[PDB]
Design a protein around this ligand. Structure first.
Ligand SMILES: Cn1cc(Cl)c(C(=O)NC2CCCC2)n1
Length: 291
């Protein structure tokens, strides 16, 4: 699967909010472009003169994420975060010249991402009370991944001592994105666990935090809530459900070719971190069928 690479696989079935540290520092920002950030300003002007209703917004930037030695006490993950914007994204990762910026970054900084906005996404493996995962169909008229299958999520907007507020906003934002798009009450949702981080190589390597969230509603109740919002209550054009039993082999299905890279990330990390049992009981042949 060349369009998705794993940057991080979390231990212990995934990490809760209280085991994660963030360092938010201008040392983690994008470097100025070799010929100057004028090239980003020019792309943005051009775009606004065709779509003057467009607006900029701040975004978290992912620099790096370091996992502690496995089995250790205390904080298990450090996220190194800077700040970027939707505009910087359109001028770098989304640019036709994005691969040239990656080569220049390797040459100048020994870092393929040095000249890339790399806004941090969030996504969810969202499971129902009757053991299905939730999928969404993207409109065929949007710019990115048109007509492809997605999972719930988005790109959160800002606002360990500013760090703990930043971790809270990341965990908060994946629940908020589930409530906005799927139309579920917040009180039907578990506290998220971080499964890992996945990079979209089709979008010059921008990364998404992938989370596990459990809903106390069944697939049929989830569908009712989604539909009862009406066409204007969601950006997706449909919802559907796959048994967690069948998610195990989704990479061998015809569905796999229709999944956008960030949704492939969420499913690979779900299969490695929440799937793949380690113990004698869940590992027995009758409960873990071979092939
Ligand atoms: C793929 N990507 C990267 C970022 Cl950043 C975003 C995002 O913030 N969304 C924007 C498109 C609609 C208006 C805002 N999307």
């Amino acid at each position: 699967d060349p369009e998705v690479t794993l940057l991080l696989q979390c231990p212990g079935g995934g990490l809760p909010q209280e085991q994660i540290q963030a360092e938010l520092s201008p040392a983690h920002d994008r470097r100025p472009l070799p010929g100057g950030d004028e090239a980003i300003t020019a792309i943005w002007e051009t775009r606004l003169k065709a779509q003057p209703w467009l607006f900029d917004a701040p975004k978290f930037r992912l620099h790096s994420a370091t996992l502690a030695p496995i089995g250790s006490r205390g904080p298990q993950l450090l996220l190194r975060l800077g700040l970027t914007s939707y505009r910087d994204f359109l001028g770098t990762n989304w640019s036709s010249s994005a691969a040239w910026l990656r080569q220049q970054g390797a040459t100048d900084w020994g870092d393929t991402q040095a000249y890339l906005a790399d806004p941090l996404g969030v996504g969810a493996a969202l499971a129902t009370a009757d053991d299905f995962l939730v999928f969404l169909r993207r409109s065929r008229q949007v710019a990115e991944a048109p007509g492809l299958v997605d999972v719930p999520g988005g790109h959160p907007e800002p606002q360990d001592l500013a760090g703990q507020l930043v971790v809270h906003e990341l965990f908060s934002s994946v629940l908020q994105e589930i409530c906005d798009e799927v139309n579920l009450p917040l009180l039907t949702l578990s506290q998220p666990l971080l499964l890992g981080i996945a990079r979209n190589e089709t979008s010059a390597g921008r990364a998404s935090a992938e989370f596990y969230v459990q809903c106390s509603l069944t697939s049929e109740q989830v569908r009712k809530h989604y539909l009862s919002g009406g066409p204007e209550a969601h950006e997706s054009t449909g919802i559907f459900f796959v048994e967690t039993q069948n998610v195990r082999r989704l990479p061998e299905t015809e569905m796999w070719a229709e999944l956008c890279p960030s949704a492939k990330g969420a499913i690979i990390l779900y299969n490695r971190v929440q799937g793949s049992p380690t113990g004698a009981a869940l590992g027995s042949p009758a409960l873990l069928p071979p092939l």
